[PDB]
UniProtKB/Swiss-Prot annotation:
Belongs to the HAD-like hydrolase superfamily. It comes from the Bacteria. GO terms for molecular function: hydrolase activity; metal ion binding. Divalent metal cation. Highest activity with Co(2+), followed by Mg(2+), Mn(2+) or Ni(2+). NCBIfam families: HAD-SF-IA-v1, HAD-SF-IA-v3. Keywords: Carbohydrate metabolism, Cobalt, Hydrolase, Magnesium, Manganese, Metal-binding, Nickel. Its EC number is 3.1.3.-. This is Phosphorylated carbohydrates phosphatase TM_1254. InterPro entries: HAD-like_sf (IPR036412), HAD-SF_hydro_IA (IPR006439), HAD_2 (IPR041492), HAD_sf (IPR023214), PGP-like_dom2 (IPR023198). It comes from Thermotoga maritima (strain ATCC 43589 / DSM 3109 / JCM 10099 / NBRC 100826 / MSB8).
Amino acid sequence: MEAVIFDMDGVLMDTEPLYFEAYRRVAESYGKPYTEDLHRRIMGVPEREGLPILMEALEIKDSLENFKKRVHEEKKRVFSELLKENPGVREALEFVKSKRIKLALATSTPQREALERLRRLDLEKYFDVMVFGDQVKNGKPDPEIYLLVLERLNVVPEKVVVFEDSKSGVEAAKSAGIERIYGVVHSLNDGKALLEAGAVALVKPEEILNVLKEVL
């Protein structure tokens, strides 16, 4: 194998579970309550259209610009306080480096934002190549992002392993010609959609290390 490629969010660390607390703090800053029942529904749509809905749902009287800024502030605080690396992922990154194999990161998250997170978690130092969502024209499921990772690594897709956590991520890597895609899951029985998109197996973050020991 010549390289191992990781998605960031949902593999190296998980931000999705902290969204409730971030949005709860926003509501609280305006003297408003917030429920998981509303939040579960708010999360079924992109944040761009989700935020304005949240503001009106909560009967908040502010400009959207001011609201978005508060959301920005509360996410920083929450992530800074509570975002931690997933168990076993550091050992997995250390293992790839121990084999003198190249290590790459691919994420839909824009560069500046993504680097802040990785730096706080001290995971940035492992990677040889990192590609971010603002570095391609069309994002997942378009294969552009994985094609650029392959380009920057200067490796053929049949010699890389990818750890992905979304349907669109798996589709993108597969469309780029990469076959060895593992779907990273977080709960009792999620992951069917990743397998249907072409993942060759499901793994928890803690199981990634043993996968690498098997395939590298």
